[PDB]
Amino acid sequence: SKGEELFTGVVPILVELDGDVNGHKFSVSGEGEGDATYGKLTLKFICTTGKLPVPWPTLVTTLVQCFSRYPDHMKQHDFFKSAMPEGYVQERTIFFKDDGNYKTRAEVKFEGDTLVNRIELKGIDFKEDGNILGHKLEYNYNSHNVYIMADKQKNGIKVNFKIRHNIEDGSVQLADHYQQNTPIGDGPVLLPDNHYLSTQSALSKDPNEKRDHMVLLEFVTAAGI
């Protein structure tokens, strides 16, 4: 099935992000492995510029939905893998409630045998003492549902969801995600029926790592036929 065939085993992942939030510039690199047969991702990310000026949980969505597990009765709805290997552009606006926003543009594609996510991130209008620039997020990640619709005119998909970030004072802050994916190549892609991805993620630290970093484990399965 061409695109799907590229994901039948474990695929190595490389992620590269250049960011600027309220003028604070930073870069992140990550590497790990993806196994779409089990909808499973394991990755380690490092801030290559020193200390990250935002909380790691705020970058999780930005830092490869081609690794979702689509059950066999739904594989006709897997846009992400169908665009491979030429890839897709993934664009987002992320609105943090009562605070600033992220705008992101990424290219996700194979570079040789590696699946590569290259991102540019621009954040504006953050409060210097809000939950983001004030580093008030707990170091954890919740479990969400990512809603996917076909966008025939753009030959891609439109995606919407809300991330719930736990805050150290017991509160929860919403991050409203608006997302558009469009193929890079010219070949035909799968335009899905409406459905959603069910996600779970666990964040941890490498006890031998001295750099500012995040270890991530993720399970993602398509559902909602």
Side-chain angles (χ1 to χ4, degrees), residues 1 6 11 65 68 74 100 106 123 127 157 165 169 201 218:
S1 317
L6 291 165
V11 175
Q65 290 173 317
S68 310
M74 313 178 48
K127 302 167 171 171
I157 56 173
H165 291 296
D169 61 1
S201 316
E218 191 158 285

Side-chain angles (χ1 to χ4, degrees), residues 41-181:
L41 297 182
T42 45
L43 288 123
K44 189 173 154 203
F45 303 90
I46 55 155
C47 181
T48 57
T49 45
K51 283 304 119 173
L52 201 65
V54 297
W56 279 110
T58 69
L59 295 179
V60 163
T61 50
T62 296
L63 297 168
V64 292
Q65 290 173 317
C66 45
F67 285 104
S68 310
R69 176 166 94 76
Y70 274 73
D72 293 311
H73 67 94
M74 313 178 48
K75 266 141 171 254
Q76 64 274 20
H77 304 294
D78 187 348
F79 161 90
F80 309 97
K81 294 192 188 53
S82 84
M84 296 299 159
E86 303 102 293
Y88 51 83
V89 177
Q90 177 162 302
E91 294 172 286
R92 293 214 181 89
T93 307
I94 305 166
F95 295 97
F96 292 92
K97 187 79 173 343
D98 291 332
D99 212 331
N101 61 85
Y102 291 168
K103 289 194 159 190
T104 66
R105 181 183 191 286
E107 291 182 29
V108 183
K109 67 191 175 283
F110 277 86
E111 289 179 26
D113 295 308
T114 298
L115 193 280
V116 178
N117 182 17
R118 295 179 186 279
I119 313 135
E120 287 195 299
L121 179 152
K122 176 75 173 176
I124 68 180
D125 293 325
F126 284 91
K127 302 167 171 171
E128 267 299 343
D129 54 358
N131 297 337
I132 292 85
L133 291 180
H135 298 259
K136 309 187 185 172
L137 268 67
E138 301 187 356
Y139 187 72
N140 56 34
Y141 213 79
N142 286 321
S143 297
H144 302 100
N145 303 121
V146 172
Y147 291 96
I148 301 178
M149 286 184 64
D151 189 335
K152 260 81 173 163
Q153 305 105 81
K154 284 92 149 211
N155 193 43
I157 56 173
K158 256 155 174 195
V159 187
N160 285 264
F161 54 97
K162 296 213 212 322
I163 295 297
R164 290 168 293 108
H165 291 296
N166 289 353
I167 307 301
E168 283 165 0
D169 61 1
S171 68
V172 175
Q173 178 175 20
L174 300 175
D176 201 3
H177 287 54
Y178 300 85
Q179 173 186 338
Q180 239 125 236
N181 297 55

